[PDB]
């Protein structure tokens, strides 16, 4: 009876603190910035071979190798320049939802509705790809995973928690609690000190890896948050939701900067990404295509319109010369 | 091109061959999703994710039981959904109706037919005959209901259980008829804990579903 009023007073204090800093908007300082113009991108490669919906995709650090996962139960490594296949990896379960590629190029990870994250070793003397470890402990399904190094990985699940794992022993070293709903997406900072997580409670949190504490909580969306990307300099969020809106958050002004929306878009958003310089923001929709946004102006610079079903995957290479997309029509396309 | 690139191309071609080989076996199995509440008797209708397999007349089926807002999206390619309701617990039928409405009107399931099992009929018969609890206590509109003239009761059945069964089945069928517009169909059935025929019913309904798809493909409907 006494504590709810204290919580409301603290929330009002935070709300009043945030309003004091809103002395300008992006829409006014960018009045002196030229538009990017019209951007045309064309298909350069088509990658064929999957027999089911594609759910996950990830680039390597050398900008040629690519990993993808689908409901046919197989995980494929592609050579983007020649379209040759390098490996084909069977999965023990076909209900896969995420995959990731190690920054050193030695390992690959995946997981799904089996509540387990599985790690594969790509470099053996026998010539085969083998399973190295199974990480158990979550109670919901596994929604996203990313490597920090060869021995540390972060996972997010549908049981409202996040975890940091020690791959050598298979034990959970930090558990991150504080959400009230299912957790969808993670994005790891370039300096590998902080990560950001979205959830079905329409909020986003900033976590400190080394201590296990929540530092900030952001709000504003009206429905589930499906995707998060992390601006290159380490100080901004890009988030997308089922309410057909994208938003840009700042960690130092601790409030929203710009909203990306249009009257003709009434479907949800599946994927969000940036280019190297941060000028373009790429987004996937249920309207069977992908839009190109001007991150500093909230205009629409272009569109990619080559798929016959939902776009589920979107990614950009480390050298910035290519974009890959994936759909439920079982195809991948390389754009430039 | 270099000899090493030709060897890489041969490896890629062999991988494509083996990917094509595996797909042929996958298409020969029909996949089913099983949903239902506790106490409904899900586990007995054909007796992270639990699985079961069974075969009738040389056609294989694969049924999945998970454990609903998010994981449901990946089950939009299944042939049919099986939904099981306990028909002998009057307090919790409104929950079953609300769940049925939430599954019928889901935007990711707009082309999937539902096979509906109304379970535990013997307990309903015993309770209606005993008369210690009445439907009118929870459903006032039952006081005005009459058994239709085209009813086909099983011989020997008391004409107070047929009224209850048809009222309960009407309550579920009425939701399905309000929306859908011909793209997907509901298939009601009455069952009990001791029945064994349940496997054949699924086979017949699946054959009907595939027949409807083939008729639509040929510009006949």
């Amino acid at each position: 009876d006494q504590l709810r009023q204290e919580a409301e007073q603290l929330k009002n204090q935070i709300r009043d603190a945030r309003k004091a800093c809103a002395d300008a908007t992006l829409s006014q300082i960018t009045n002196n910035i030229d538009p990017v113009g019209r951007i045309q991108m064309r298909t350069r490669r088509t990658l064929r071979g999957h027999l089911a919906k594609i759910y996950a995709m990830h680039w390597g650090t050398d900008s040629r190798l690519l990993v993808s996962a689908s409901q046919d139960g197989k995980l494929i490594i592609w050579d983007s320049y020649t379209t040759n296949k390098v490996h084909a990896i069977p999965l023990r379960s076909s209900w896969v939802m995420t995959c990731a590629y190690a920054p050193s190029g030695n390992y690959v990870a995946c997981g799904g509705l089996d509540n387990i994250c599985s790690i594969y070793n790509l470099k053996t003397r026998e010539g085969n790809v083998r399973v190295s470890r199974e990480l158990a402990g979550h109670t919901g399904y596994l929604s996203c995973c990313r490597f920090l190094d060869d021995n540390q990985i972060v996972t997010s699940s549908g049981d409202t928690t996040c975890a940091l794992w020690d791959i050598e022993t298979g034990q959970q070293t930090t558990t991150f609690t504080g959400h009230t709903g299912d957790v969808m997406s993670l994005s790891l900072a370039p300096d590998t000190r902080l990560f950001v997580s979205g959830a079905c409670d329409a909020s986003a949190k900033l976590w400190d890896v080394r201590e296990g504490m929540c530092r900030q909580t952001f709000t504003g969306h009206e429905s589930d948050i499906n995707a998060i990307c992390f601006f290159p300099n380490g100080n901004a969020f890009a988030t997308g939701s089922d309410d057909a809106t994208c938003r840009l958050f700042d960690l130092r002004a601790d409030q929203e900067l710009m909203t990306y929306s249009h009257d003709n878009i009434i479907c949800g958003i599946t994927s969000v990404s940036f280019s190297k310089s941060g000028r373009l923001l790429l987004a996937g929709y249920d309207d069977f295509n992908c839009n190109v946004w001007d991150a500093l102006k909230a205009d629409r610079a272009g569109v990619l319109a080559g798929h016959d079903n939902r776009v589920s995957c979107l990614g950009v290479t480390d050298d910035g010369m290519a974009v890959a997309t994936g759909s439920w029509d079982s195809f991948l396309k390389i754009w430039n | 091109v270099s000899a090493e690139d030709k060897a890489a191309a041969e490896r890629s071609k062999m991988i494509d061959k083996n990917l094509r080989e595996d797909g042929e076996k996958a298409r020969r199995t029909l996949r089913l999703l099983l949903l239902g509440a506790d106490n409904s008797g899900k586990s007995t209708i054909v007796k992270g994710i639990f699985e079961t397999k069974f075969q009738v007349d040389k056609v294989n089926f694969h049924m999945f039981d998970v454990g609903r807002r998010k994981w449901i999206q990946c089950f939009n390619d299944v042939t049919a959904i099986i939904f099981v309701v306990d028909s002998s617990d009057y307090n919790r039928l409104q929950e079953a109706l609300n769940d049925f409405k939430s599954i019928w009107n889901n935007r990711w399931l707009r082309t999937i037919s539902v096979i509906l099992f109304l379970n535990k009929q013997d307990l309903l018969a015993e309770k209606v005959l005993a008369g210690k609890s009445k439907i009118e206590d929870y459903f006032p509109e039952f006081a005005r209901y009459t058994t239709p003239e085209d009813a086909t009761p099983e011989p020997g059945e008391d004409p107070r259980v047929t009224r209850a069964k048809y009222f309960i089945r009407k309550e579920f069928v009425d939701i399905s008829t309000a929306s859908g517009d011909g793209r997907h169909i509901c298939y009601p059935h009455f069952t009990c804990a001791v029945d064994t025929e349940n496997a054949r019913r699924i086979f017949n309904d699946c054959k009907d579903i595939i027949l409807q798809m083939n008729l639509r493909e040929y510009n006949l409907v």
Partner: single-chain antibody, 230 residues
Framework: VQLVESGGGLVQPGGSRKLSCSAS????????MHWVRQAPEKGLEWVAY????????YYADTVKGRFTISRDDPKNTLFLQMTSLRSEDTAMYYC??????????????WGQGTTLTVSSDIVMTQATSSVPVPGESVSISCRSS???????????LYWFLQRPGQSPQLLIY???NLASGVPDRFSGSGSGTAFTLTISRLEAEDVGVYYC?????????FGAGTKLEL
């Protein structure tokens, strides 16, 4: 990872004999295989090659019509059938494992070998016969008749070491990639038609004959060999 060769012995000119190799410890069906020959006073020579799926077969220009290479995946054995043997066929025969995909190491493991007793090409040139020489720096050179640099950015040069009583061991592939298990004392470089190998600090285990091989076009060719005498 183990490869064992069998067969061999003494034959008369005009006869025939068949060799076999038994593989274990790895996915035999995923690798391509080579036969390489060494004569007492000649160095190494390439003989034949069979692809992993038995798709393609190549032969040397001195053995076409006389030698036949075959594969048996379910039993993990290779065979080489030889007919109409000549005096020039007396030599040591080695079995070599190879796999090709982006980033692989195609000549990593060599067998032990067996003995047989009877009774346009790119030229790779090495010329010093012996380098006299612990703790000193040594540089060994090779030179080719045609450029080994392909338009895709790769240059196809390989280095091998043969210690006394041992099979050749892979050191460097594609001119600069240090093979697994090798200490970081070895390095290599070059451009176009001239190549060098550098050893930063010698030990007692760095004594033997060093070979160069090119892998642009078939037939495969080797150099004469440079002997390092400590």
């Amino acid at each position: 990872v183990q490869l064992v060769e069998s067969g061999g012995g003494l034959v008369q000119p005009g006869g025939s004999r068949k060799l076999s190799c038994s593989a274990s410890g790895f996915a035999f069906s995923s690798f391509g295989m080579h036969w390489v020959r060494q004569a007492p006073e000649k160095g190494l020579e390439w003989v034949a090659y069979i692809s992993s799926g038995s798709g393609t077969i190549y032969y040397a220009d001195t053995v076409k019509g006389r030698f036949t290479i075959s594969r048996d995946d379910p039993k993990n054995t290779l065979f080489l059938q030889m007919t109409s043997l000549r005096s020039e066929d007396t030599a040591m025969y080695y079995c070599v494992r190879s796999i090709y995909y982006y980033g692989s190491s195609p000549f990593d493991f060599w067998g032990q070998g067996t003995t047989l007793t009877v009774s346009s090409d790119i030229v790779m040139t090495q010329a010093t016969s012996s380098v006299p020489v612990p703790g000193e720096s040594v540089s060994i050179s090779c030179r080719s008749s045609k450029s080994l640099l392909h338009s895709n950015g790769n240059t196809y040069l390989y280095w091998f070491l043969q210690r006394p009583g041992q099979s050749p061991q892979l050191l460097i592939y594609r001119m600069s990639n240090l093979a697994s298990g090798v200490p970081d004392r070895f390095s290599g470089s070059g451009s176009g038609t001239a190549f060098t190998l550098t050893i930063s600090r010698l030990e007692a285990e760095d004594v033997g004959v060093y070979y160069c091989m090119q892998h642009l076009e078939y037939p495969l060719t080797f150099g004469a060999g440079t002997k390092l005498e400590l």
